[PDB]
RNA sequence: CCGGCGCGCG
DNA sequence: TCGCGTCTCTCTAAAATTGCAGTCCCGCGCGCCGTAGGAC
DNA sequence: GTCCTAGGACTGCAATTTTAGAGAGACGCGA
């Protein structure tokens, strides 16, 4: 509604999956951290993306 | 294609449209962007927010028709019987769209 | 299966396209189902 | 020289 | 002389359950049992 | 004896099963 042609669509896009990726890593290293398990976040960014 | 002139296309070619009917799409398709507007970004606010949605018990049966003569009795049961056989302007311009204006 | 054959033959793949095209504006231009047909 | 059922090992 | 809520359906838009489809660690060893049915 | 011989647990999702919503042609009653 703020924005129109695709500024809307992309900036939107952008800011979700930005955010979601953010939250995507932290929760699946908070379950391995109260574990003990210690994994890369290049490993997880892999299957993030 | 059976027509001669869908050679070319991919998927043939675009259907005919006259020149009167794209010209009301093109209105059409204006006034809902103006319409979309509206609510994105006080009685002058109803008044052209309806004007923008406007530019789209026998008797009752007589409008699925083109209603030959009728009106007195008896008349339009037979119709109805027999038909079965055939079976502000200034205030909205204030707005302005701004598509293409990065 | 011999009348659905002989109606898979002698489709106009086309036609079919732009006849779903219309009806999608129709239905567009006018809420579960007459999404789900806009689907189909 | 094919599949089911049962029992096991890491 | 029609007019009036309305009897009895009437057809479809919109959810609301509901019956499939799909899936469910890896690698080894051994044994047993199939292969059925009927008028001769 | 036999030799041929014909019933989990969860998720996802479209399919029935309504529920409703208005709605209308003929109408018994009625003005």
Same mark, same amino acid.
């Given at each position: ?17 930005? &955010? ?7 929760? %699946?290293?908070?379950?391995? =951290?109260? &574990?003990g398990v210690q994994?890369?976040?290049?490993? %997880?960014?892999?299957?993030? =993306? | ?75 339009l049961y037979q ?24 | ?13 086309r036609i079919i ?24």
């Open positions: 509604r703020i924005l129109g042609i695709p500024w809307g669509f992309l900036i939107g896009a952008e800011l979700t999956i930005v &955010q979601s990726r953010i939250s995507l890593v932290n929760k %699946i290293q908070k379950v391995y =951290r109260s &574990q994994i890369h976040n290049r490993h %997880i960014e892999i299957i993030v =993306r | 294609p059976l027509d001669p002139d869908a050679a070319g296309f991919i998927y043939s070619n675009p259907i005919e449209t006259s020149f009167k009917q794209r010209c009301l799409e093109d209105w059409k398709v204006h006034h809902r962007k103006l319409l979309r507007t509206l609510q994105s970004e006080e009685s002058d606010y109803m008044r052209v927010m309806e004007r923008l949605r406007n530019i789209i018990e026998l008797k009752e049966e007589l409008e699925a028709q083109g209603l030959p003569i009728d009106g007195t009795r008896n008349v119709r109805v019987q027999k038909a079965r056989r055939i079976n502000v302007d200034e205030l909205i311009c204030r707005i302005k769209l701004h598509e293409g204006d990065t | 299966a011999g009348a659905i054959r002989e109606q898979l033959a002698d489709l106009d793949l396209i732009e006849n779903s095209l219309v009806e999608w504006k129709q239905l567009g231009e006018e809420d579960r189902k007459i999404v789900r047909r806009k689907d189909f």
